[PDB]
Amino acid sequence: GKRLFAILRLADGSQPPFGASVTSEKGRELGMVADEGLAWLSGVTPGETLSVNWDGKIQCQVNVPETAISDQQLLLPCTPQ
Ligand SMILES: [Co+2]
């Protein structure tokens, strides 16, 4: 499964800001965070680690479940490195 509807929230409960970028381990930009911490991600690999970037910096990372499949909405807890 490769396209994910990701609900992003940090460990502290906050939301990554509107306009943050989400990148794969490889460094590819799979999507951008919209409002309310929602990010549609393209070409995601199940099991990989994504980084969420804003303010010119990796702010936190998420672990895409190995069981992720296409068009799945899932919570991705974003934890600071
Ligand atoms: Co860019």
Task: Give Cα separations from 49 to 35, 52, 78 (angstroms).
Answer: 22, 10, 10
Q: How close is the Cα of 22 to the center of ligand 1, in Å?
A: 9
Q: Where are the domains of the chain?
A: 5-80
Q: How close is the Cα of 71 to the center of ligand 1, in Å?
A: 24
Collect all residues with Cβ–Cβ distance below 8 Å to 17 and sequence separation of at least 6.
33, 54
Resolution for this experimental structure (Å) = 2.1
Q: How close is the Cα of 75 to the center of ligand 1, in Å?
A: 24
Q: Are 51 and 80 in contact (CB under 8 A)?
A: no
Q: Are 31 and 40 in contact (CB under 8 A)?
A: yes
Q: How close is the Cα of 15 to the center of ligand 1, in Å?
A: 20
> What's the CATH number of domain 5-80, 2.30.29.30, 3.30.565.10, 3.90.1150.10, 2.60.40.2070?
2.60.40.2070
This entry's atomic model was obtained through X-ray
Q: How close is the Cα of 53 to the center of ligand 1, in Å?
A: 10
